[PDB]
Amino acid sequence: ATHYSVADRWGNAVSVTYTINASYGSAASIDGAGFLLNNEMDDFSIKPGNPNLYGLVGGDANAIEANKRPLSSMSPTIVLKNNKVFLVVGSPGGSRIITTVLQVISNVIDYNMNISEAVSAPRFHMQWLPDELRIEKFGMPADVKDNLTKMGYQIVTKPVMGDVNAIQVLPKTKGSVFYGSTDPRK
């Protein structure tokens, strides 16, 4: 997946995440047509309790049926403030999408980060199975890691999570100022 965010002068916002699933999808292209096929079928549960590419599991609800759409984690999001566009945000990352996006939103609303700060801030991740707290290199100092380990977390440092392209729209004395950030991880 890849995420893109658009906001216009009339007050429309469009948040799009789209994907062929894995990097280069299924790796097979349609001969004569020049495009790669998705491997989106792996987003179904192909057998109960079997972990997929992102360690996600399922049973009946996300089992394969003809014509059914495989469950996604894509989270293209729009945040409103006073019924005006405030944030347009999303990310790739498979299972990490949901936690990446919510962290960017929290960084703005809870911590008063600007959109650039909110996107660049280190991210953590918990997806139940595997039972680990996933973090980024340089993302969490020893004191914080120590205290979380004492709570019972198993902390693991893995490659950086996500690729947020986000817009923050702020009211100006007349009209709007549109701010954008891409992701330093990309």
Partner 1 sequence: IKNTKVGLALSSHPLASEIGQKVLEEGGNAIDAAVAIGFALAVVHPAAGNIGGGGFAVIHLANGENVALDFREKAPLKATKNMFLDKQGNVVPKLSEDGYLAAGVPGTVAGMEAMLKKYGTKKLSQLIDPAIKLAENGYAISQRQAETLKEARERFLKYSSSKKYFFKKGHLDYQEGDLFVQKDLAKTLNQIKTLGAKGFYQGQVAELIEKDMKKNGGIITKEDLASYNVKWRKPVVGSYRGYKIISMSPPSSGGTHLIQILNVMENADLSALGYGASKNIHIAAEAMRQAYADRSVYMGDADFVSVPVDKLINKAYAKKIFDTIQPDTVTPSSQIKPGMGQLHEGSN
Q: Which residues pair with 166 in a beta bridge?
A: 181
Contact 73, 95 (CB under 8 A): yes
Task: Select the residue interacting with ligand GTB from 74, 88, 89, 164 (CB under 6 A).
Answer: 74
Binding of residue 35 to partner 1 (CB under 8 A): yes
Contact 179, 17 (CB under 8 A): no
Return the SS3 of 87: strand
Binding of residue 144 to partner 1 (CB under 8 A): yes
Binding of residue 92 to ligand GTB (CB under 6 A): yes
Contact 144, 151 (CB under 8 A): no
Binding of residue 56 to ligand GTB (CB under 6 A): no
Task: Select the residue interacting with partner 1 from 160, 161, 163, 184 (CB under 8 A).
Answer: 163
> Which of the stretches 21-29, 90-98, 110-118, 151-159 binds a second copy when contact is defined by CB under 8 A?
110-118
Alpha carbon distances (Å) from 65 to 19, 40, 49, 52, 54: 21, 14, 17, 17, 21
Binding of residue 94 to partner 1 (CB under 8 A): no
The binding site for a second copy (CB under 8 A) comprises: 111, 113, 116-117, 120-121, 138, 141, 143-144, 146-147, 184
